[PDB]
Structures are given as structure tokens and as C-alpha cells.
Symmetry: C4
Subunit: 389 residues, 4 copies
Amino acid sequence: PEWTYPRLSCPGSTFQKALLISPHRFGETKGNSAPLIIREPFIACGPKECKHFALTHYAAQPGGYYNGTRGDRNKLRHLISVKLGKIPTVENSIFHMAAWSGSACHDGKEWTYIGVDGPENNALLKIKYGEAYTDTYHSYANNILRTQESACNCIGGNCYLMITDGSASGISECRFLKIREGRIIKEIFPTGRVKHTEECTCGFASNKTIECACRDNSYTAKRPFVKLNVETDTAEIRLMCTETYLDTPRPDDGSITGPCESNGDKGSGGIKGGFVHQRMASKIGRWYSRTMSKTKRMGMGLYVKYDGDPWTDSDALALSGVMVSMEEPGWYSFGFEIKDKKCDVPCIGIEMVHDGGKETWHSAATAIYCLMGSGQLLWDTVTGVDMAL
Amino acid sequence: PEWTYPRLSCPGSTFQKALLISPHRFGETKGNSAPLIIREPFIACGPKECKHFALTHYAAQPGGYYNGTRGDRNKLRHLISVKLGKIPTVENSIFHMAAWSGSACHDGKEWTYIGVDGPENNALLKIKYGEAYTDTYHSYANNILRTQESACNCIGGNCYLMITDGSASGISECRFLKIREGRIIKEIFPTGRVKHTEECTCGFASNKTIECACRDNSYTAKRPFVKLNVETDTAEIRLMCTETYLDTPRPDDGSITGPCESNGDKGSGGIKGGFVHQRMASKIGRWYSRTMSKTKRMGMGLYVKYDGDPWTDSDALALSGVMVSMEEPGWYSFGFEIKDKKCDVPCIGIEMVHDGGKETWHSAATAIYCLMGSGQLLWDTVTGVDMAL
Amino acid sequence: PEWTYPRLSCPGSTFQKALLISPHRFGETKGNSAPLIIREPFIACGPKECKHFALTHYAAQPGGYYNGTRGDRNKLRHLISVKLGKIPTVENSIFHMAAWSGSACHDGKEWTYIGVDGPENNALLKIKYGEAYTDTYHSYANNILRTQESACNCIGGNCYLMITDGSASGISECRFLKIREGRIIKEIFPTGRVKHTEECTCGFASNKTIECACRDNSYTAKRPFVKLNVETDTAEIRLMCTETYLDTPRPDDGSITGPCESNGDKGSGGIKGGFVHQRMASKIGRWYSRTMSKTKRMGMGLYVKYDGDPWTDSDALALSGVMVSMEEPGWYSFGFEIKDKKCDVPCIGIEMVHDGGKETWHSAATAIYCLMGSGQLLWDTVTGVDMAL
Amino acid sequence: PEWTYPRLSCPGSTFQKALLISPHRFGETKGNSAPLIIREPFIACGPKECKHFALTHYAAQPGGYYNGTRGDRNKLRHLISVKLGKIPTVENSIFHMAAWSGSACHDGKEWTYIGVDGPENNALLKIKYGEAYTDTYHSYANNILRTQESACNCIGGNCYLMITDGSASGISECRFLKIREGRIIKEIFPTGRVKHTEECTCGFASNKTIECACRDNSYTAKRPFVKLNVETDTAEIRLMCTETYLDTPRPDDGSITGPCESNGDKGSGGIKGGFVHQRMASKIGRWYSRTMSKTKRMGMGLYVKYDGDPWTDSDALALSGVMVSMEEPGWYSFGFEIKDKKCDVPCIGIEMVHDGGKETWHSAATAIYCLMGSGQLLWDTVTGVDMAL
Ligand SMILES: *[C@@H]1O[C@H](CO)[C@@H](O)[C@H](O)[C@H]1NC(C)=O
Ligand SMILES: *[C@@H]1O[C@H](CO)[C@@H](O)[C@H](O)[C@H]1NC(C)=O
Ligand SMILES: *[C@@H]1O[C@H](CO)[C@@H](O)[C@H](O)[C@H]1NC(C)=O
Ligand SMILES: *[C@@H]1O[C@H](CO)[C@@H](O)[C@H](O)[C@H]1NC(C)=O
Ligand SMILES: [Ca+2]
Ligand SMILES: [Ca+2]
Ligand SMILES: [Ca+2]
Ligand SMILES: [Ca+2]
Ligand SMILES: [Y+3]
Ligand SMILES: [Y+3]
Ligand SMILES: [Y+3]
Ligand SMILES: [Y+3]
Ligand SMILES: [Y+3]
């Protein structure tokens, strides 16, 4: 086996409903299954397999450990995975390491697993390469050291990963780690609009550039947009200029007055958002997703723009389709690529959280849309889960 | 690994009971298992493995999602599989894709998975090659685009698949797709009697010809019989002439007056029926199954004719044995071949549906009969399932 | 991979308790497991793996299908397996074929699976090679065609298998099938004392000879002893002369008066008995097992003799150790060999049946003893199962 | 594949929390899982996999077999394993052999499994190489022959194992076994302070030397410290001189007056302790763990000293971090090494026993800490298990 590189995307001009992983369709009291209580799912693929990752509360449904599953950080939280297609139950899952913030990616040769745990003021990112724990990175702003919640990205053996640290309501200057065979070989300090960046969804724009659509939880409903040149190891961040603001909450499309760099209103709070590249010979496609509600984590719409510069383009993103109706939960979303024999398949995954408050269990299904064929997006996704059962 | 081709069948002059997959033997309230609620099972084999496929309602027994399991189409329906031999439970199964109509086949190098989902009036057939979503095909008659419910058929890398679209009670003109490494490279418009063809059970008559025994749900109890030439990529459909009408419902054997092409009576309604080839040096054997009841989906009998032309032969099919008695349910049936070291084993599988109406769960077992040795077919298959438990 | 052959046995002079497979330790109502209800377990090893085989009633514990589990023949009975070491549950097991009498063996390249089902008066032996059903053999005495209930024996690709047919209370003249790559290539008609022979436990004495210790269910408590020359394909049978009669029921040791060939008393009824070879350079060891009780299926003792001729030697077998106490069930026993890097390890497995009558479930654990090291057999095996739970 | 050897340890100056295996998070009555009841867990790694071993009472939670799970020795006890990461349930686990004292290790080519069973006064150690039972060793002091409860240690094909035998309250003179491909090829009689040594946690100090930190259950709270030279096959035992006494129970640090060899007080009783090597070019790190309580099996601290001689060094061990708080159970602890591509990762595993006395179930979680990165140990480990559920 050799190092993997991003290839030209497979043919197609539209996404379609691919797969639903809804493990709590089997968590009824009347049932005999043990789906794990999880959140922050993401997917990462290598040359033969895709892995469905999530962070678990180390508790199952049905079970006696529902209390505390709405929180994110605790000493029980672990990064888990199944082969994509398998239901993430107790027995099907594999536990990688203790983590309440994760990431993972395959470099052509081996899996890299990323897991942050530790106290709020001094958290720790841990790196696992296959079975071995290989490196760590330390909290630098002493306020919840955090990572992508989606796949990291490997090229020629070098895997790039966004980390962040800082107040959820204030400054969180992200950084990028260059990781090779489980070990950090460079720290990359981005320049530009670095005020607040977290939960970057990153992918390859080419063999030269990794691009991320990120979350600003404090200041803007515009997504910070990272451009990382992997040849010079330099990163730059500016807000997406598009009137189609991708964060939730958000104000009305186009209502933020001023040039591209204006913040301005409804900026506090946020959501991780899906983003994936369609690489063609002389054209680049950028696919994004955002909730159907402006304020709530309800529904999910898929958007697209071809070519241009996301930093300077005020033009609206074209609405491609409704992946999750307004009646269904649409929480975190993420991008990932499936590796076909000769080309790469861009896909958007959606976390669809089962939320009934703190007095009951709190977990998530995963819906997957992929680029396939031509036409328009045809069907939405439902979890089918009644939380009373 | 290289492309696969049909071969001479293994020696044998009779089918025998091979294996029952009855997952609901373990779905009691008093038990601790989670057999999936499924229907439309089928089996497809490659050079080392046979996968048992089905369409699931994403629901288990015991469980609290029985309502809507008598229906076929919904947003939750998925194409699943296990290694043949394994019980298709929640954990054992793998979820390939959302689909309420399915098919799959191995081409010698990789699995092609087929799955139709979407709305009634604009459904979508989706193709997966291994892990990658690779192609789609669109609804052409806008009335439930549908596919085989059994294995597609690959030769030298080219996999042929029957798709149909149109009214269940009127016109459904089927088409064939030629699929290579997950992408459609040719549409094949059949000629002849094309009024209504669905749920074709296809198989290789030789390296030149694919033949299918299909379902007319509207006009006839004779099965439409496809002959696809894979070298010229041309298909032709005519009704089976035999007096031994294979559909359910059906009138008495030989009661349809007129020449081969006559419809005539008890044609509305239908059932997918099993069909497999026994290829010998200078002789062909065609094996078929039909319900033991003329009107109801009860029982399953195995029939055989050697040589001749199914389009013009009015001779009765030889009754070979009773695979499922009149007291046991006999729903869909399908053909498949197991790959032995140097030769191919023809098999008929039978969906035995557990039907207690819409007020309880609705699922199936799968009975398997294969060509083996000489003599006569000796034993029938029962599910052993009590639906009150 | 190449054909396998019997090798010199691994060093050792005593058997010891190796492993207990007791699945119903997890079948409590208070539990969350699904151990399968089985009987007639046996084990067969290839160059890398040992598979634990049994015949299941297609039912679990806890479950609602206990009625009929004391019977042996029914339309639900299947041959199952797990990797030795795994608990045979619903999900862990693989179902090979319908069978109420079984056998299996590895030839160096692939598994041969053997399964008899069908009606009493016309039963059918079915052969599976890997995934393909390959051959059948027909009932020749029309009264429960039957087979070993233990591993068959392969050499140079030729697998030898005992089959029998005939009354349980009168004549059952056994035959041997030579099977190659799933297909029968010779029938071997044994000569000699052929009155009644069933459930042969067979093993290699050398590269030239297969020897079996069998059950006479009608006439004698002496075990018929087969000697099959695999080079000339000839088989001979005579009763074991030893005063240590191995069948249950049986009279007192040495109480049968007359020369080697005398029957005489308590001959009706019987049990399958364990038998395995310890092959040394200039010496052979024969290991056998028999119940501790003379009349009941309670207890299991291990016995040994070196060299000599089992047909003419009246000398008592040396008692080696008590594998199962009088207080524990001791039902069927069998021989098998584990494949070490350069040598073979002889082992005796014991079926320990949980018998509460017909009004409850009826299944079995498996105890394994193997040759290992020097000294004397040290510890007995209990199932630890309380049938009320 | 070729024989494995200890290598330079991976870069790192601190241990961090790596992974919790807490199978009883799933054993609620309201739950649908079957975690095995186990104790004495330990981990051993080969070049591609780590296996998490334990000794089971052949019982699950929930279950009806809780009575007797506080004891150690019985006829049901077995050595089991899962891939490290997987929850050790009835279905996930594999049963290696009957054993109420265990060990295991990988030699670069195959797994060696060690398991002691038998009666108190004549126990038997059993060796399994892959699937084959290969050798045994006999009781020499006739009072509970016993082994490591942690991984044995292989170099160039030779695997070294500590065995002991004798009163738990008096003399237990340990021996070492040199095991090659599952067969004992040398007995090694240690010299020196040999009064009482058991449950050695062993590791490679270098390619020349294996060092062990052991338990004296009778005379001292100092750990007997073995140094085995693998080239000459000689062993020597002396008590650890450090004032930081590692056993539990124990008096205050440095309260044992006298030279290094002095016993003196609170010596009766004890606990197996963790111990692993950090091998660097011209420096050795020795990592140890002891309970946080002096008297009770509560908490677990990690300690470290670099260089020097454990036999003569009276200096306090540096407190590195608190892996398990005083409020959480801290029972047996053990050392193991994970194999990275070019170096070895030292790790400490901690058995966290759920103890509610003999009137309920008795089992354990496993906490893992590994060397990763720089700084200081950051977070403790809780089981999260409520034993009423
Ligand atoms: C990226 O680089 C590799 C070789 O370095 C090449 O094979 C591949 O086609 C390139 N990817 C794109 C998108 O051009
Ligand atoms: C089909 O063709 C392949 C080569 O093209 C050949 O090996 C095979 O035997 C042929 N099949 C039949 C049924 O003759
Ligand atoms: C049996 O035959 C093969 C060669 O045919 C040989 O390698 C093996 O050692 C022989 N077995 C015995 C028991 O001598
Ligand atoms: C131990 O020995 C082997 C070769 O004998 C060598 O490859 C390895 O690096 C040595 N280990 C250490 C720790 O020096
Ligand atoms: Ca925001
Ligand atoms: Ca019809
Ligand atoms: Ca008898
Ligand atoms: Ca002590
Ligand atoms: Y959060
Ligand atoms: Y339908
Ligand atoms: Y019987
Ligand atoms: Y103990
Ligand atoms: Y399971």
C-alpha cells in the first residue's frame, strides 16, 4: 500500500439519498438490542472501507445511564466506530480511546484516530495510529481544546487537522496540526480573520489546497472559510461572503449589510456544517448544507456553487434539495469522500439528534447523501424513531 | 481476480432441500434476539461467497415498529445483506442503501448493489459498486420505477438488470440496463410482447443469452419470458406458452384457449416466480416454481422442462416436487447459482412470508432448494414460526 | 494450500481438561443471551481453525420452541458451526444445511459438510463443499439413513465417511463413502461382522488405515471396530474383544463369556463413544471414553491401550481418568485432532446433555480433553447449568 | 513473519488516560447486553493487535449465576479474550481454555496462552500455542500452583513466564519457565530473596534482561523485584528498596527501618501491581502503580523513576499522577506494551473491580494509561457503573 491523494471526483451533477444509520429504531424497551448513545457522528473512508465514527456516552438504549447524555464532556466519553453500514451497538462497535471531541482519517496505509479529553482548562488531544497511541497536543488557550468532529485529511502521508481552543462566547483562534504516521511534525498558525473558528469541516480542493467551512459560535452567522496550502503549509481564514449564510442561528439571507467581512447580527451560537468538494478537470464544485430553520436545529438543505472565490462571492448559493424536512431534526453535518476504483465520491452526512431534553436519553441517527448521477435531489430522510418507546 | 462467466452446471438431475433461513424462530418476546423485519429476500453468489439479501423496514422482532411493515414503500426501507448461512439480525446485517426495490450481483471482481427509492411518481434506481455510490437511473413512466427483487447477471464485467415502471394494473414496459463497474453504459429496449413485465427472474442460458421468467400483474397468468442477447444487446419478450401457468392467481392448467400469445383470464394480480437454468453440454434444463394454490400465496412446487422453446412449447411442465406444502406460505421465489470449483449449482429460493395482517409484524423466512445428485425431490420446508409468540 | 495427511502425534502421555463450551450458562430468563438448542456436537479441525459443529432444533434459550427438542428428526433440524472457542448463539453460529444427522471434515483446501435429512423411510445424505452443495446419497435400507455425528477423515483429498441405514433394534449394515471435493467417487462395502454398526467414531491409525469405534444399538455392548485400508479401499469390521466394554448400557467388565466374537447380554441400546489415535514412531496409542454409569448416560471415563489388536486383545483397557463425574451428564463422545505446526494433537470431546424430560428444553454443553504433557488426568468437568433458570 | 524483540520505546515523558473498557455499563436489568463476569484482566499485544484477556466465571450480567463469583477457583473458570477495544460479552469473547490463573503473549509469529486449573493441592498449568494445546507443568509445592495474571514475555521465540506455588500466608518460591512454540524447554530457578513471590508483572528492560515487580502476600509491603538474564537464563530476586512501597496493604512511606532487605511490618496480604519499562538509548524509565489507599483496594497512582538500581535505591518514587481517585476501586494493575511501527508504547492497565460482596455479582472494568506526549498526567478514570442496576 502507498500514500493516498485526492483524485478527480466521480461523474455526476446531483446528490441523492444514499443511506440512513438510525440505531435507535432498535432501542425499544420491547426490543432486544443495544444501540449506543452517541453524538457528533462523522464518516471517514480509506481505499477499501468507510468507518462510521461517533462520540459515545458509554451507555446504551434501553439502559440506566441516560442522565448526563445531553452534556458533551465527561470522563466516560469515548470515540467509537463501526464499518459504515453496521449498526453501532455495544457489540458491533470498537472503542478507540477516551474522547469528548474527535476526528479520524486514513492516509493510504493506516488509520489516524484523534481524541480530546481532560479538564476544561487544560484539555488534551491524543493521537492513535492504528493500535498505538503515538502523540499528544496541549491546550494553548486553556478553554476547551477542541477539534473538527469530522474527518481529517491526508495527502502523501501528511494528515492535516484543525484544532481550536478558547471561549465558546469569545475568542477561539484555531490552529492546524500536520500529522505523519501518528506524530505531529508541524504546527500551522492561520492568518487573517482568526477571531473565532471551530468545528471546521475540511476537504481537498486540489492536491495544493485544503478548504474548510467552519463555525463561529460568537460573532457571525457567516462561516469562517479556511484555505490551507499544503505545499507551503500556510493557512488563511476569511468569512464566506455568500448571502446564503450557513450557520444556525442566522438572520435572513443577504440581510447582513456591508462588504464581505461584515459580521454582523445573530452571530452568537452556531452549528457544525457540511462541506464537500466536487473536483472536475477545469471546474470545482463546492457543496454545503445548512438547517432548514433559521433559528432551530430542524431540517437540512443542500446547496451548491461552482468555481469563484467563497471569500469574495456575495452571490447566493443555489438550493439543490431538501435532505431533511423541517419536521425532522437536522443537527451537525459533515463532508466525506468515498473512494471508488479510479475516482472519489463526495458525500454529506447529517447528524439527526433524538432530543427529548435532559430527562431522557440523547443520541443521534446519521443520514448520508452522495453525488450520484444527474437530475435533482429526490427524497428527504426521516429517523423513524419514536422516543417514547 | 478476473471477470466471471456462466459455466456448465454441476452434475445432478433433481433438486433437494438445502437450507432454511428462518430468523423469526428467534423473535419471541420470551427470547433475546433481534431478527430484522424484511421481505423480498434474494440470494446472489460470487466466486467465494453467497450473500442473502432482503429489503428491511428498519425494524426488528420483538419491537415497537410493526405498524407499516405490510407496506412496501417508505422512507425507512433499506437493502440489507448477510453472508448466506447467517441469521439476518440487527447486528449481523449490513445496510447497503435506502431502497424499497432491490437487486445485486457479483461480476468476478466486485459487488454491484441496486436499490430503488423515492416518491411513487418519480422514483430513482441507485447503484453501488462495492462501497461507492456510482450511478442512478430515473423514472421514465412515473409510476413506481421498480426492479427484479433478485440477482442481476454479470458476464465479462457487464451486468444486466431488468427495470420496469408503470401501473400495477395497466401498462408497465420493462427496460434492461447494461451496468459495468457500477455505471450504466447501455439502455436495452426490449421488443415484442412488452405490455406488462415486472420482477423478472433472470439467469444465463449460455454465454450468449439471458432468459427471464417475469410477472404480468395485469393481463395474464402466463409469465412474460425475456430472451436477452448479451452479444448484440437485444431483448425480446413473449409469453410462456406452457399450459402450466406459473403466476398466482391463475386459472386451471391449459384452460387458456387460443395460440401461445393468448392472455386470457384471471390475469390481474401476480407473483414473482423462481426460475433457474441447468446448463449441460448439448441440453438445457429450465427449472421453475409456482405456488401450490392457484389463488393464494400458499405452497411452492418445483417444475422442470428440458430443451424446446418456452415461447412455443405448450406442453405441460413436469412436476418435480413439492418444496413448500399447501399449509405453509409460499410467496416470492427466485433463482440463483452457487459457484463450485469448476461448475455452477442452480438453486431456487423461496420467500415464506409470515402474514398475520396489518395489526402485527410482517416478515419472511427463506427456503433454499438446490440441484444435487440424482433421484426425486424428497422433503418440504416449514418455517416453524408461531406468530403469537 | 495442499492436501492434508495424518502426522505423528504431538508429544504427551496424558490427557487433561482443555476447554468447556457450556452455552446455556447464558440461557437464563434473567439473561440477555440466545444460546442455541443443539445435540450431537462434534469438532473438526483444519490447518488453521477448529469448528465446533452441532445439530440445532432452530430454537434458542430462553425461547418458545422447547416442545420437540428431545426428538432428533424434524424438518427444522440444521447442521450449525462456530469457531471452537465461540459460544454457539443465534448470531455467532452459521447454518450450513438442513440435517438431523451430520458430519464434517477439512481436506487441506476446503471444508466438506455432511447432513442427512428427509423422511424415515427414504432419508438423504447431502454433501456441501465450502459453499456449494455438490452431491447426495440415497437410503439403501429405508430406515433412517444415518452418519457419524463426528468428523469424517480426509487424506490426500479423499475424505472417508461412515453411513448406516437400518432398524435401531435390528440390522444396520453400515457402508463407507469415499468423497473427493464434495463428490462421492467410491462406495466401500465392509466385510466381516456387519450385523449392526452406527455412529462410528473414526480416525487415522496411520497413512494406510482408518479405524473406528462404533455403536451396536441392538446386539452387543462390545463396540464394533472398523479397520479401513485407504490404499486398497477395503473395510473390515469385528467387535472389540476388550473386557472393558465401551457402550452404554453394558454388563460388568469381562462378564461376557466366550471368545472375542461373542455378543452376548445387555446389547440393546447404546451410545456414541469417543475414540482417538495417538500416533508415535514405533507405537500406537488408542484412547477411548465411556460413561461412568453402566446403564445411564452419567459420567465419562477416559481409557487407553498401546499397540495390540482391538479385535483379539481381551485385556482390560487402562483407566486413565474421570473426565466427567457420575453426578454430571455424560452423553455422546467423539475423537478429533488439533493441527499443531508440525504434529497432531489427539482430543476427546464430550456431549454433556441438559436433560429435564420432554416438558422443557433439551440441549448440550461440550467438554474437551486433549493430550498434553505428562503425568495423570487431573480435573473433571461440570456444566454449571441449573435448568430451572 | 519473524520473531519479535523489545525495541526502544516511543518518544514520551508522561502517561495519559487512553481507554476505558467498562463492560458493566451495559449489564443493567433494563438493558439487552451480556457483559461477562470476569476478574484478573490483562492485555498483551503482538505486531498488529492487542488482546484484552480476563478470567471469567462463565456467567454474564444480568444473569442467575452470581453466587461464587467472589471466589477465584472453580471448575467453570476460563481464560477469555477480545480484541482490545471490543466489549467482552458472551458473543464477542472467545474461550481459550479452563483456567483460574492466566497469562498470554505473542512471539512475533503466534499467540501463547497460559492457563492454570485443577485442585488446590495439585493444580496444572496448561499451554496453548495458537489453537493447539501443546504442554503442561505440574504443581511443585502442592498449594495452588499460580501464574502472572499478566502478559508473558517473548524474545527471539523464547517466552518467559513466572509461575509460583505455595501458601498464600507462608512460603511461595516462584520459578520461571522458558517456553518456545508452546513447549517448555527450560526451568529457571531464581536465587536470592525467594521467600515469597507471586503475580509478577514482567517486562523487558533491554534485550538482555527481563524485570518483574511482584507480590509478597506474607512478609513485606516491598515488592520482590526479579531480574532475569535471558542470555544466560539466570534469575535473581531482591526486595525493592524504595521507601515508596507498592503493595497494598502497606505502612507509611519510609517507615520500614533498616537496610534495603528489611521486611518488616504490615506485610501479610497484598495486591498485584503495574510495572512497565520506558527504554531509551542511554536511559531507562521504570513506571509503577500502587493504590491510593494504604490499606484498601481504592484508587491508583502512577509513579516513576529513571535509572539506578531498584534493589539499592531507597529514594522515593516520583508521583506522576492519579489514574484512579480514592473514591474509585483500584484492584490489580499490570504493564503491557503496544507495538507502533518502529517503537514500543509502554502502558499500565488497571482492574477496577465492582465489589458489592458475595450476595451479588463480582466483576471488573479495565482502565488503560499509556505513555503519550509531554507534560503531566491530566485525568482520572471512573467506571460509571451503578451496581444496583
Ligand atoms: C494528485 O497527485 C497525485 C500524484 O502526486 C496524482 O496521481 C493525482 O491525479 C492528483 N490529483 C488530482 C486531483 O489531480
Ligand atoms: C463461457 O465463456 C468462457 C470464456 O469466454 C468459457 O470459459 C466458459 O466455459 C463458457 N461458458 C459456457 C457455458 O460454455
Ligand atoms: C503420511 O504421508 C505424508 C506423505 O504422503 C507424510 O508427509 C506424513 O509424515 C505421513 N504420516 C505418517 C503418520 O507417517
Ligand atoms: C534488540 O535486538 C534486536 C536484534 O537482535 C534489535 O533489532 C533491537 O533493536 C534490539 N532492541 C534494543 C532495545 O536495542
Ligand atoms: Ca454563529
Ligand atoms: Ca398475472
Ligand atoms: Ca449396545
Ligand atoms: Ca504484602
Ligand atoms: Y459541544
Ligand atoms: Y410490492
Ligand atoms: Y438419535
Ligand atoms: Y486470588
Ligand atoms: Y449480539
